[PDB]
Each structure stands twice: as C-alpha cells, then as structure tokens.
C-alpha cells in the first residue's frame, strides 16, 4: 500500500498502522507529509513523533495571548495584568521568579486571584506544599502535586475530606496507593469519610486502609464502592473485599449470584457449591459469506458500524455474520446485542491448537479472548497485531530470528495459524519461568521484566492475611492489574469448557510463595 492508496481509505487505526509502516521505512517524503495530519485517526505517540521528525509543529499558542509569551521571569512586571495572570498558570514559571517579584505579584492578585497569591507566597517559602496545606487551597494542592510528586506531608481531617471533590483526586489516590509513595499523604487518607467518596476512589481508599491494617475503615470504603460502582464486575470486586474482611454470608451469597463472570463471582460460586455459570454455545450452520476476515480495513469499517448500531441494527448484522467463517464477528455482535448479559467463550481456528495439552489451549484462548475477542486483524492503539496482539518488535524477532519463516512480515500476525503458533511459543517461554497463569498474563501484557521485579519484592505475592488478593490490587500498572484478573477468569472458564477443570482456589494457593 502506497501513501496515495492509503489516503483513499477512511481514517482508522489500520490506516494509521500502515502510515506508520511507511514512516519507519523512511518512505514518506517531506512533500507526502504535508497534508498528512488530517489523514491520521489518532495523532498520538509514535506516529506523531515520527511525522514530526519530518515536519515539526512549533504550534500551538492562542493568537490572543501571543504577546504574553514574549515576557520572561525578568520582564514579567512590564506585562499587562492579563499577561501576568496567564503566565502564572505555570508553577515552573512561578518557581523561576525571584521572591521580591513573587511578593509584588501576590499583592497585585490578592483580591481577584487569591489562588495565584497563595501559590506566589508559597514559593517564597522553603516548603510550598506546607503553605498551601495550611491555607487549605484545594486547587493549589493539586497544581503542586502535578508540579512535583516529591512533596509529602500530613493532612488533617478537614483538609483530606475536601480533596475528593476535585477531579484530580482519583488519579492522585490511585497513583500514590499503588506506587507506595507519599506515605504521609497515604496515612492521612485513612481519615477520609466514606460518605465523601465513591466508585474507584472509595475502592482504592479501601485498599489503602488494608495496607495499614484498618480493616473496619477498609470494610466501610469497599461497601461504599459496592453501592456506587457502575459496572457489576467492579461491584463484585468490592463485595469480595467486604466478605474477606467481615465474612457476612449474605455478601458472599450476593457475590455468588452475580450476572458478571469474573474471578470474584467464580470464586464465590465455588465456595458455596453453586454451579458453574452458563456459557453460550454458538454453532452457525451457514459456512461462509463475502466478508474478508484478512482485510484490516474491512474490520475497522464493520467495527465502527457495530459500535454505532442501535438495538435494532445489530439484529441485521448478527444475521449477516452468523457464519462459521465470521464466527468471531458474530460473537462480538452478540456480546453487544445482549448488553453483556450472556457469556461467550468461542474457540475459533481450533484446528491450530487441538494438539496442545488442554491447559495450554485454555491459556492461549484466555489471552486471545481478552487481547482481541479473536478478531484476526485486530490492531491496538500501540499497533499490537492480530488475535494474540503481538507488538511488531517481538513478532519480527520470533518470525525472523527464531522461527526463520521465509518472507516473514509482521502482518503474518493477522493469520490465526501464526498468532496461535507464536502465542504458544511465547507462552512457553513465560510459563517456564513464572508457572502461574496469572503471572504469565501479567508478563504477557507488561513484560517479564516488570513481572520479575514485582515478584522479587518482599511485599508482593508472599504470605499474609489477605493474600494473594491484596497483592493483585497493588500490581503497579493499572492495565496489567486489570488484564491479569480478566485473563485468569477466562482461563478458568476455558479449562472448564475443555473438560480440564481446576478449582480457582488452587490457582490462588499457588500464588503464595515462601
Ligand atoms: C487490559 O487489556 C489490554 C488489552 O486490551 C485489548 O483491548 C480489549 C478489547 C476491546 O475491544 C475489543 C477487543 O478487546 C487490546 N486490543 C485492542 C484491539 O486494542 C490489547 O492490545 C491490550 O493488550
């Protein structure tokens, strides 16, 4: 695909991927690059930095404030008042001023922008955070946290109960709790009233409370999380903690009867001798249609239609894709169509894995379901490719240096036989070092480097009251924390479907090392 032919396709991640391929091979000239912004679906990350080696953007500054950016720390007192206030939106700029000018500006702004005044005078002290915390300036607090994460201080009950009202609070709480940073902030957040938080914030504050062995406060946070969470899966995670902490048997019962299939509801079913949830069975009699499952542009198109279809239009697409050849698209449509109420665990291109042992089949399928929902031409925002969502670098190393496939191209990852084969091969390497399918999942998504670093710590996946569940809440990258939970549920299910059942309790026991 030449740049001219790509330009005649709709904007999409696939079109981006292919533009990126031209760029990394140095095939986009300065002239081709001129009209190219408008041809990129998602102008973020690698494709942006690559295009910018060819055509910098010096942008962007609002024509109105242009003259404000002609001043520096040394001339800011010569600027009009509007220009003065615009420049003071940057804490680095404020930090750069000398203290006499911070004093002068603080007076200028006392009446109309006391927020600026507080930051100006704060930077005249040796601890600006302490000054801001004494004023209980909430906006100031978050601006300082965003400026530097190194500030750490005890916060009293009144102040910490004000933080949750700011949009920055949820990321602030999450970051410092899962990174184990800012201990004085963390300890202080024990005194946040559960009434003042909800949803993810409440949940993280429950995890925080467990790390300090405040199990009652933890129960109260998790219970507020349970009552406010929008998604049933997250609600289940909170109900699980409520149960582990207090062992009210109504909590476990509610979790065992959840409509969401996840590790918590599966475990609850197993603890209460409740039957395994019903898994749908999709077996279309019709064998093929016109659709090319190997065309990534056709997937981007159909995917957009499916996501924008009303309750009614799905039914038309369901019927059209009700074939063996488009099984992955059928199940994808059905999953949306039934508003996530039914459980679909398909096994497409099964011939390519039927000779592996069943445990290996389940792990493969478990990864694929989460990675791509088995869409052969799936492309991620980082341009991970195919059913098993290989990054190009690893695909080329396996494809070219290890397996030496003749005329290998990274787009071979779009073929099911290749995806399953490379997945099997990579999963072999991970399993041999890590053993648990959870740990393999973490390493598959996040790399074996971060997984090995997490498992070398003395406070992760070791023995303890609430292990291994607590450790699973403190996995330091959000995407990997989530990924491992979802893939582990998938794994349990597929082991069951393949008549190679395991108790999820056995999985959890083998996460604790000594
Ligand atoms: C937390 O999981 C990380 C993986 O998420 C996948 O996204 C899930 C999607 C949602 O859309 C339908 C298919 O499943 C990513 N896959 C894609 C195509 O973006 C995957 O790359 C990522 O590792």
Name the residue of 14, 262, 376, 378 to mutate for ligand 1: max ligand atoms within 8 A of Cβ: 378
The token pair at 144 is 């300082």
Question: Nominal resolution in Å?
Answer: 2.2
Our separate counts of H helices and E strands in the chain read 28, 0
Ligand 1 proximity of 252 Cβ (cutoff 6 Å): no
75/82 Cα distance (integer angstroms)? 14
Instruction: Report whether 417 contacts 405 (CB < 8 A).
Output: no
Is residue 390 classed as helix, strand or coil in its secondary structure? strand
Residue 462 zone, left/alpha/beta (φ > 0; ψ -120 to 50; rest): beta
Displacement of CA 279 from its chain's centroid (Å): 27
The token pair at 225 is 């999380």
The burial class, CB within 10 Å (0-12 / 13-18 / 19+), for 456 is exposed
Instruction: Report whether 382 contacts 394 (CB < 8 A).
Output: no
CA of 262 to the centre of ligand 1 (A): 17
Is residue 217 classed as helix, strand or coil in its secondary structure? helix
Instruction: Report whether 358 contacts 499 (CB < 8 A).
Output: yes
Ligand 1 proximity of 419 Cβ (cutoff 6 Å): no
Question: Alpha helices, DSSP H only, in 65-152?
Answer: 81-87, 91-96, 99-109, 114-122, 128-135, 138-147
Instruction: Report whether 480 contacts 473 (CB < 8 A).
Output: no
Ligand 1 proximity of 389 Cβ (cutoff 6 Å): yes
The token pair at 414 is 């779009």
CA of 370 to the centre of ligand 1 (A): 6
Query: Which residue's CA is the closest to the ligand 1 atom numbered 9?
Result: 372
Experimental method: X-ray
> Hey, what's the torsion of the CAs at 69, 70, 76, 79, to 10 degrees?
-90
CA of 294 to the centre of ligand 1 (A): 19
The token pair at 458 is 């003395």
CA of 372 to the centre of ligand 1 (A): 6
């Amino acid at each position: 695909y030449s740049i001219e032919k790509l330009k005649k396709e709709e904007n999409s991640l696939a079109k981006d991927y292919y533009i990126y391929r031209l760029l990394e091979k140095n095939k986009i000239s300065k002239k081709d690059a001129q009209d190219l912004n408008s041809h990129i679906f998602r102008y973020i990350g690698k494709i942006k930095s690559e295009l910018e080696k060819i055509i910098p953007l010096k942008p962007y500054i609002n024509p109105k404030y242009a003259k404000c950016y002609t001043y520096t720390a040394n001339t800011i007192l010569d600027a009009n008042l509007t220009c003065q206030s615009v420049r003071l939106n940057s804490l680095v700029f404020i930090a750069s001023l000398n203290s006499k000018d911070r004093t002068t500006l603080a007076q200028t702004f006392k009446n109309q922008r006391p927020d600026l005044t507080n930051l100006l005078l704060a930077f005249n002290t040796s601890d600006p955070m302490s000054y801001i915390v004494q004023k209980e300036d909430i906006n100031g607090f978050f601006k300082l946290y965003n400026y530097s994460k190194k500030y750490d201080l005890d916060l009293n009950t009144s102040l910490v109960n004000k933080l949750p009202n700011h949009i920055g609070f949820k990321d602030f709480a999450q970051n410092i709790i899962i990174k184990k940073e800012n201990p004085k902030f963390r300890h202080s957040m024990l005194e946040i009233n559960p009434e003042n938080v909800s949803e993810d914030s409440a949940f993280y504050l429950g995890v925080n409370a467990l790390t300090y062995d405040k199990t009652e406060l933890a129960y109260d946070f998790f219970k507020k999380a349970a009552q406010s969470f929008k998604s049933q899966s997250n609600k289940d995670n909170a109900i699980f903690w409520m149960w582990l902490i207090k062992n009210n048997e109504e909590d476990l019962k509610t979790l065992s009867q959840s409509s969401s299939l996840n590790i918590y509801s599966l475990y609850a079913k197993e603890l209460t001798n409740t039957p395994f949830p019903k898994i749908e069975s999709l077996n279309p009699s019709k064998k093929k249609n016109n659709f090319n499952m190997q065309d990534p542009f056709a997937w981007q198109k159909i995917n957009k239609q499916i996501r924008d279809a009303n309750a009614s239009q799905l039914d038309v697409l369901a019927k059209e894709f009700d074939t063996q050849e488009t099984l992955p698209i059928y199940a994808y449509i059905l999953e949306r169509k039934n508003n996530f109420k039914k459980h679909y665990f398909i096994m497409p291109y099964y011939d390519n894995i039927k000779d592996y042992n069943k445990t290996r089949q389940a792990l493969i399928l478990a990864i694929a379901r989460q990675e791509s929902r088995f869409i052969p031409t799936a492309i991620s925002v980082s341009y991970a490719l195919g059913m098993m969502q290989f990054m190009p670098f690893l695909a080329n190393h396996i494809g070219e240096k290890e397996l030496k496939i003749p005329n290998f191209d990274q787009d071979f990852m779009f073929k099911p036989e290749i995806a399953y084969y490379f997945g099997n091969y990579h999963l072999n390497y991970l399993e041999s070092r890590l053993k648990s399918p959870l740990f393999v999942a973490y390493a598959y998504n996040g790399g074996i480097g971060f997984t090995n670093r997490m498992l070398a710590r003395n406070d992760m996946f070791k023995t303890g009251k609430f292990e291994p569940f607590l450790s699973m809440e403190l996995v330091p990258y959000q995407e990997s924390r989530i990924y491992g939970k979802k893939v582990l549920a998938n794994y349990i299910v597929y082991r069951h479907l393949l008549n190679d059942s395991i108790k999820i309790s056995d999985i959890f026991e083998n996460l604790i090392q000594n």
